[PDB]
Design a protein around this ligand. Structure first.
Ligand SMILES: CC(=O)N[C@@H]1[C@@H](OP(=O)(O)OP(=O)(O)OC[C@H]2O[C@@H](n3ccc(=O)[nH]c3=O)[C@H](O)[C@@H]2O)O[C@H](C(=O)O)[C@@H](O)[C@@H]1O
Ligand SMILES: CC(=O)N[C@@H]1[C@@H](OP(=O)(O)OP(=O)(O)OC[C@H]2O[C@@H](n3ccc(=O)[nH]c3=O)[C@H](O)[C@@H]2O)O[C@H](C(=O)O)[C@@H](O)[C@@H]1O
Lengths: 418, 418
């Protein structure tokens, strides 16, 4: 059986590779000719454990082929769309999805199964099914089938979770869901639950909104910790030993391709809400500013003129271990303080900043701001680092610092114990 | 050792019993003379699995004694306060706690260990330690010791969780925490984590606020489900199969002795916050009204004038399986519709309502409102019982109804699928 995967992003490529390694002849498609060239060389354009090893495997097996030509998709039995669905202002941007749907309409044949993996507002799958019908003259549930199979994989653990995570499949028609289930069973060992399209769409958004809201609650606990003389990270670890509690982690912010917008996708077409999801978003969105407040409070303590201060921001990626800066709170932080200080330096072991090394970025700096929890920052000799700084100041926004370095002015989000 | 337990509520009495059966001589104290009389013969003034069998055991072996005489507390090596800490308007009511503390001051000796189990705002344990010092002339950490040992037990499984639950102990002094740990290790098999008083106080409140806020999030998902044509309960069950997701349960309301007030205790002395905890409380507090909205909507659909409608409320307790109505949303619901309806009937298998049976309460009724998820309601033959009603209307506020009954006008919180 032939499967076509449209959108070879950090979830689409792994998806194509996994199916190609599970018995299917797969054709990966992406409008970006640059991405196709790189993937053909056996090396992925994205960083994800095992992706290069697995990519070469399927390329050698002859089970996976990638292209940027729509024509190569003709003859596919299944079409899986994995394109991005970011916001367009305050509205969901479904242009990438519609483009992919129209491409499928061009080559689709009777009996085809179309699966939308992209995260979308409730009602989107059915609308796209109606679009396919209008462009082909065919009928969903009779001539072709459409289903929504949202992902749950965590970047950095994608191949493992693709197999072990339980997942949901919502069919526009029952047969669509049944056909899709058989497909994923080729590698999924977790449970597969079938429902309708709208329920699957809402469930996916609910998963991510639950996460975003819980991070917001954690950040409010961080604010409260300052006033009660508590180390919020310690309090959370302690609280989480309760059989029914699993408080998330507070910090400088929430980045990535999902949490910053999925809650908005969930509210997008709602004519009525309570506002809890909205305030949680505002809370997470304001943490870079929270960190800025700690920085200026520290600079004042050290009697340092802001207009002459040199700030070293450690980390640019939206989370530790990646080179991705999508919606990174570190970037927002830089944007906030750039016009309030004399110089803002940046360093990231995975992303090119103003300086290419930690030692260099802190040399002569007045303060350090830990914006990303990269592994490199967990074994730093702050004692040695401090000796090269003009002022020993550290503002931790990622729970990197545990016991504060000696002789350093230290501030941390939720660190009311210092 | 001789341990004195002040406050024999559903946490205090079991605590006293556990210590009495763990190699300690215990004296349970409570101002309520009626409660004491019941205890020493009439076993447990409260209902909890195993409490009667366990109680008789410790009373018979002479390891546990209960009294309402302060004098009997003299000679105790440890004092454990388990009194209530409800709200008084918008303020935490610590009068019961202060009373217990002053009682302890009258009978304690040098070397005494004082443990506050009661849920309290951060900083309270320290303040009570200071009060004890001013009343006795002794110094904490030298002449006596104070620690906070918050509870995590769930009514209905108290003796089980008392033993296996990991718990937190925060001492005003390090020595107090160590002493308290050796004390609780007598029956606690779960992990015991030691920290300072304020951290322990905040952790306890964070646990319950996490639960409350997550219930409010679920309630917002319920509102959204109405608009997206989704059964929120099915969506939650599906979403919770995600490795990092555990959305709580929405419904008619949040009652009990804890969740309705603990978030307020957490914010009580905070000069600044973000608002998520506060607005979440408000959301849960308006769910009885949300249910009322569904009822009136259903009556309108049935062309029934509310002023002439007979409503049958099923459930009075704050949660299924108990007779406790503390802060019950069922009571709030009745109060809300009382003057808008001709007659409000109530039935609960554990607490006597206006009618003694489901059969009698629905006879000639215009609508049924399920306010508590009692076991009895889970097997009801709704179609059969509906034959005696004036109108077949059901408003479900506890997901007791799965598949809507045939011929009924059905509405349910978060039931957008009907
Ligand atoms: C409910 C859930 O766990 N969703 C996951 C989420 O993956 P995502 O790529 O957004 O990464 P993440 O680990 O949530 O991190 C996103 C952002 O949030 C931050 N973050 C994360 C957890 C936390 O407790 N605190 C916190 O501040 C991270 O630092 C990062 O800036 O979104 C994925 C997606 O929707 O592709 C989804 O498959 C994943 O399962
Ligand atoms: C974090 C946590 O699990 N806290 C527990 C809580 O026990 P509590 O006695 O308040 O009962 P509960 O099961 O939370 O129910 C309280 C109220 O909330 C409602 N409730 C509960 C869970 C849910 O998902 N949705 C919901 O609406 C119940 O119906 C009830 O009206 O408070 C206890 C306490 O503080 O004594 C504590 O020890 C328990 O561990």
């Amino acid at each position: 059986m032939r499967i076509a995967v449209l959108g070879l992003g950090y979830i689409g490529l792994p998806t194509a590779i996994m199916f190609a390694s599970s018995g299917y002849d797969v054709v990966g498609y992406d409008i970006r000719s640059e991405v196709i060239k790189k993937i053909n060389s056996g090396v992925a354009h994205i960083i994800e454990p095992e992706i290069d090893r697995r990519l070469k495997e399927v390329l050698s097996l002859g089970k996976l082929k990638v292209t940027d030509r729509v024509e190569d998709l003709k003859g596919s039995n299944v079409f899986i769309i994995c394109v991005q669905t970011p916001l367009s202002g305050d509205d969901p941007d479904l242009s990438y999805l519609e483009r992919a749907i129209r491409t499928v309409a061009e080559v689709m044949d009777r009996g085809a199964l179309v699966i939308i993996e992209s995260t979308i507002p409730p009602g989107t799958t059915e609308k796209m099914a109606r679009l396919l019908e209008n462009l082909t003259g065919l009928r969903e549930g009779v001539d072709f089938y459409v289903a929504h199979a949202p992902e749950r994989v965590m970047p950095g653990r994608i191949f493992k979770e693709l197999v072990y995570n339980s997942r949901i499949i919502g069919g526009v028609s029952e047969k669509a869901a049944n056909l899709a289930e058989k497909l994923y069973r080729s590698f999924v060992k977790g449970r597969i639950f079938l429902t309708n399209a709208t329920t699957a769409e809402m469930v996916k958004l609910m998963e991510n909104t639950f996460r975003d809201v819980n991070i917001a609650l954690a950040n409010e606990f961080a604010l409260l910790a300052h006033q009660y003389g508590v180390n919020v990270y310690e309090a959370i670890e302690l609280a989480n030993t309760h059989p029914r509690v699993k408080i998330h982690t507070p910090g400088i912010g929430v980045g990535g391709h999902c949490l910053p917008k999925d809650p908005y996708l969930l509210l997008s077409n709602a004519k009525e809400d309570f506002g809890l999801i909205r305030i949680a978003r505002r809370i997470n969105e304001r943490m870079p500013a929270f960190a800025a407040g700690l920085l200026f409070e520290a600079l004042e303590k050290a009697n340092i003129k802001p207009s002459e201060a040199i700030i070293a921001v450690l980390g640019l990626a939206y989370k530790g271990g990646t080179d991705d800066t999508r919606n990174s709170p570190a970037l927002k932080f830089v944007e906030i303080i750039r016009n309030s200080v004399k110089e803002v330096r940046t360093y990231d072991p995975y992303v090119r900043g103003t300086h290419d090394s930690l030692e260099k970025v802190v040399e002569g700096a007045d303060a350090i701001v830990i914006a990303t929890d990269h592994p490199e920052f967990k074994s730093v000799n702050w004692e040695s680092i401090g000796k090269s700084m003009r002022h020993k100041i550290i503002i931790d926004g990622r729970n990197i610092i545990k016991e504060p370095p000696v002789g350093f002015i230290f501030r941390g989000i939720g660190r009311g114990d210092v």
